[PDB]
């Protein structure tokens, strides 16, 4: 429990000893400013709860200052590893916190600040980026396309893999990934087999099928995936050299070393300049193996086995 502000003491002790013999005129412009400073935090807290119906997120600095939050972290019943992690990433801690207004009675205004508990720490995590994989025909509507639908964040947890499909709810601080398990699916470790062999029988990899061949790009951690189809002009450009690669039809990748810009059609993408090593793993596109005549081309939420069964 924290007492962050004592307006009762400041109004009854300082101020309010004004001898109201019709005058009350005991004042100094200093204590007028000082009262404004003390009262402003209450006003800002009242403002925030008025526009958020008593529940706010992230917890603002008015709701909990940095010093108060750090002190709160220091006294929480958690490991020193968890205290160090929360202290070093206070801004993420604020983003993953709620402020719920409880009660105002007995000269006490009380609200609960609901802080995160990071029970899983320092386990390896990886991110999966997927792009559509169509056939390279120039004509429109004459293509069969396939796309892996399991993109997102994956992290090892209690002998399983916690999978976060909406990667926009995960915050990355350098090499650290902050994720909420309430937005996660628990999967067997064999889900990583979809990255070494999509046709493995130990896990049924998730894909979707389509006949719309449209060009796009996916910016990854250390590179860019380019899906070029039809007559779209896809190029990789450098800030000091200009266009240095023209992609052919199909799915290709380029690392961020030597490349600062990827253009797909009329869309220009800046690649991340993060330092790291990239590896191109050669292989035949799996869409080549499928006969278009018996190809199920509107499987929105499907799998490798399910598509094989329909064929």
């Amino acid at each position: 429990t924290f007492k962050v502000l004592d307006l009762k003491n400041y109004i009854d002790k300082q101020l309010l000893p004004i001898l109201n013999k019709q005058s009350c005129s005991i004042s100094n412009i200093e204590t007028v400013i000082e009262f404004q400073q003390k009262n402003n935090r209450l006003l800002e807290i009242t403002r925030e709860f008025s526009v958020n119906a008593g529940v706010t997120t992230p917890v603002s600095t008015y709701m909990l200052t940095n010093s108060e939050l750090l002190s709160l972290i220091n006294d929480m019943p958690i490991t020193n590893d968890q205290k160090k992690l929360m202290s070093n990433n206070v801004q993420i801690v604020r983003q993953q916190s709620y402020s719920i207004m409880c009660i105002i009675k007995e000269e006490v205004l009380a609200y609960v600040v609901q802080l995160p508990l990071y029970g899983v720490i320092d386990t390896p995590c990886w991110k999966l980026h997927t792009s559509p994989l169509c056939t390279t025909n120039t004509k429109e509507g004459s293509n069969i396309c396939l796309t892996r639908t399991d993109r997102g964040w994956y992290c090892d947890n209690a002998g399983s893999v916690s999978f976060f499909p909406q990667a926009e709810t995960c915050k990355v601080q350098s090499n650290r990934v902050f994720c909420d398990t309430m937005n996660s699916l628990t999967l067997p470790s064999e889900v990583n087999l979809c990255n070494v062999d999509i046709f493995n029988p130990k896990y049924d990899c998730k894909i979707m099928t389509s006949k719309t061949d449209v060009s796009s790009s996916v910016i990854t951690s250390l590179g860019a995936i380019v899906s070029c189809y039809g007559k779209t002009k896809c190029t990789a450009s450098n800030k000091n050299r200009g266009i240095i690669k023209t992609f052919s039809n199909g799915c290709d990748y380029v690392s961020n070393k030597g490349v600062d810009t990827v253009s797909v059609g009329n869309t220009l993408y800046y690649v991340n300049k993060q330092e790291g090593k990239s590896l191109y793993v050669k292989g035949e596109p799996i869409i080549n193996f499928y006969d278009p005549l018996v190809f199920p081309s509107d499987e929105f939420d499907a799998s490798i086995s399910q598509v094989n069964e329909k064929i």
Epitope: K3, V4, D6, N9, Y10, K13, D75
Partner: antibody, heavy 121, light 108 residues
Framework: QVQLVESGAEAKKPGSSVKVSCKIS????????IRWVRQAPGQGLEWMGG????????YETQKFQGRLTLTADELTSTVYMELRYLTSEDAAVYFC??????????????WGQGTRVTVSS | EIVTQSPGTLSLSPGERATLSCRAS???????LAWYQQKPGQAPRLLIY???NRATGIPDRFSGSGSGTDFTLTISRLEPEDFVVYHC?????????FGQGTKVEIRR
Amino acid sequence: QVQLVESGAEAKKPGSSVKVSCKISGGTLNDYPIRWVRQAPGQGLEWMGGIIPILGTSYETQKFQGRLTLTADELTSTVYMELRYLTSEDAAVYFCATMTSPVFIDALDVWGQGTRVTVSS
Amino acid sequence: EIVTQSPGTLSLSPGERATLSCRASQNVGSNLLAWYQQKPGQAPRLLIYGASNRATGIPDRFSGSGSGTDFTLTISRLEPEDFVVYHCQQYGSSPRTFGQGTKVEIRR
């Protein structure tokens, strides 16, 4: 290690004001609100009041409101108490105390050496 | 709020078990009862907080028990250094009130 060092012994004539100091070592004033307690010789302890510098606030018990003033000085890491309108029943040993954890609430962990105050005649 | 201690003076031989009582006028909120040991002419030392939890570094010969109105401090076997005064404080309500104190003296 947090510790408190108090001022020397004082002897004062009745009706005057006495001001006792308490300097904290090993900890910040904002991290350690200071409670002022006293005991007359032979008698038990008596809770006088307390100061919370981090809130810039102070309080005294009903028996000491209007006579006891608690103040803090952060740059010298010191807390001062001042008692006025002295009486024969105000000669006692005065202690400043604190606590090392929030679980104690008001179980006082660290104490000052004490300061003897003699209401003279 | 009143918290009175019993007895005024305790006479026990060294190595015997000491039992000190602290009663209250009304129920102490959350069993917020503390026991301090004070040597002659120095600051009190905190022994028990929460009426049962002993502080850091305090030998396990000191223990606390009780609830509501009545609380007890027990010394399993008295050391020569244990014959000092002992105070009980309540901090479950405002103002915080101490006890009169109990003296433990060597019987001979």
